[model samples]
Target: VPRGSHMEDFVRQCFNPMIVELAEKAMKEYGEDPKIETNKFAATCTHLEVCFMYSDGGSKHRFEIIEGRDRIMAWTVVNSICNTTGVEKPKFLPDLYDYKENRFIEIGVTRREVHIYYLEKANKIKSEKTHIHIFSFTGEEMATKADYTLDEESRARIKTRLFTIRQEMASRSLWDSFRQSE
Candidate 1:
């Protein structure tokens, strides 16, 4: 099956159940409330699509633009698939600022994972509460694997493959917002 189709099935069969089970287990173990949600995941599929389009693909210097793009798109698609089955999106540290009056403020935005802290005095400090959104994508592994053994030749090959993938992805153009080669 095509990667996307395979992902679609994987998301439905594996991602959803895992998320639901985890949530239920947490609620039962810790007495926290549980909620479930889902959404359809979508994105470009190849490297070229990502670099020239999304710009959020893997290493800018290592992989060709196309490879980075595909890596990003693959991640996005995987995240989307997980979303469809009620897996929360991954959370990351939100951008933050140290404001006047000794208060630390978090910039509101969605994050895949994160941590926050507050200082009470010169030496003493307090850890602030944090929230996380959960989601999974195969792109992380795919990109990692693609770049794991980084000899010059391997890097060059990965870049070339990324470029080819992007070209193919652009030809598909399933979504309008994905036009530029970022």
Candidate 2:
């Protein structure tokens, strides 16, 4: 008999276990008990859908508009899929203020991945505690091997992609709120 597929195998073997395991580690960053929040599942998935994190046909960028445990769940689910086949890990570039060094740091985006830069804000100090982010999507089986870093040329292309998304959002005045792109 033929095995169903890699996707089905992953769902049967790793899906919930990975979520539960990673959520425990992610929750410790909150200094709370490392227990799964079953209630937050629906809202977290809804946010991902709106942000287009669940797509392979195209890409989109959005700010982290959720907070607390909800935000933790979102991050956990997003990063966890990095281990899965054919899904691109959602890019996260936080414009962090290094309080220890008293300076700001911008880690540039990598390639073949959708870069979701954290919007610049006044009070964004790097977290004191340690954390590991979980790492999305598609029909037509997206590139099984996605690039984890960008060279000079691909960096240029990703930035061009970034510009188009921002331009479209601006055309609709979506960035009218307190926001700044990096």
Candidate 3:
């Protein structure tokens, strides 16, 4: 599965848990060495609809577009996991800014999984505090496992396969309000 495959059809889609999961698998299956892959135009961005601290309300995920001065700075997440649409509204706590050191450009994608809880919900979470956990992606499944060792041919090939989706958006010259790829 291509990491950013359906991104070719952006607006109408956010990262699906299924495709997102597949992307993780692809990234880990990336078979080559990162030797020369470092000095490259590398950009990683993704959004998953899941719980924040695995909070279960009525929704499973939230995707927010982070806007900065002019350009879209990034794709952020809000976890009101399982927040049912008709039940109530999702909660927004301006707590995301606390992750000053946790952006992908620095540490890569983050994943949080498997936690035993003392509190939870698939419905009204009758709580007041909210938080976000950060982790860098260790699932090498997101990258291209093109070769045993990093080589020029693999480099170009991977970039094409990986970046093509982004380029596709550009080709349309459509104003990507989401700044999905810039």
Candidate 4:
């Protein structure tokens, strides 16, 4: 196995047998092709395969379980696999899963400092409505910096937006709803 790569070990220990069983079960139930294999950095068992990437000199790694099976069912199985492997449940699943494509609205106080807020739907996040606040500071002092102020009215508006986002995030069911596309 490579320094930070657990693919080989994981495949040897967990994926191989599990995938065999999964393939047999899937073939019986859905009558679909149930091929399983491993490439350089990933393992494909049945219709579900996990991809892995290393970061920061192999100190950190990330994984994605791509389900060629049912999307929602794949999500659940992936969650179970993670839990079995001692991974903690994420505080914000959607943020964990849907980080880049989702955009946040910025409420700025100045050119150098701003607050960003975003709403993540319930099912995506696996929690009640949740709000994420990010405070960024880019220090560039200028003589005529625009005074972007959050006055009383602005504060109320921002607060309202945050509340609504939180409520929506909270209302989603923890289970995955969408099916995966083959």
Candidate No. with top TM-score: 2
Give the per-residue Cα lDDT of candidate 3 at 157: 42
lDDT of 4 at 107: 20
State the lDDT of candidate 1 residue by residue for 1-182, as single tens digits: 13344323332443335433543443444444332111122121221222232223234542212122223554564355345544333332211111111212122111112111111111131223222111112111121112222234533443454444335434554222222211
- For candidate 4, the 10 contiguous residues with the lowest summed lDDT are 50-59
Sort all candidates by lDDT, best to worst. 2, 4, 1, 3
Q: How many backbone clashes does candidate 4 have?
A: 6
Query: Using Cα atoms with residue i matched to residue i, what is each candidate's TM-score against the true structure?
Result: 0.21, 0.23, 0.22, 0.21
Give residue 179's error in model 2 in angstroms.
2.1
Q: Write one digit per residue (lDDT tens) for candidate 2, span 1-182.
A: 33343322322232245444444444555554322232122112222322222121221221222222355565664454334322343344222222332222233221113223222211232432212111211101111023222234533443444444335434545333202221
Per-residue lDDT of candidate 4, residues 1-182 (tens digit): 23432333443443456554544454545544333222211213311321111011111222232323444565575476446654444443221221221211112112122321122222344433222222211322111023222234533443343333224323442111111111
> Global lDDT for candidate 4?
0.30
Query: In model 3, which runs have C-alpha deviations exceeding 4 angstroms?
Result: 1-149, 172-175, 178-182
- Model 3: per-residue Cα lDDT over 39-118, one tens digit each: 11122223222122112221333222221111212222333322422222234222222222221111112222212111
* Model 2 spans with C-alpha error above 4 angstroms: 1-149, 178-182
Q: Candidate 3: how large is its RMSD?
A: 18.2
TM-score of 1: 0.21
User: Per TM-score, what order, best first?
Assistant: 2, 3, 1, 4
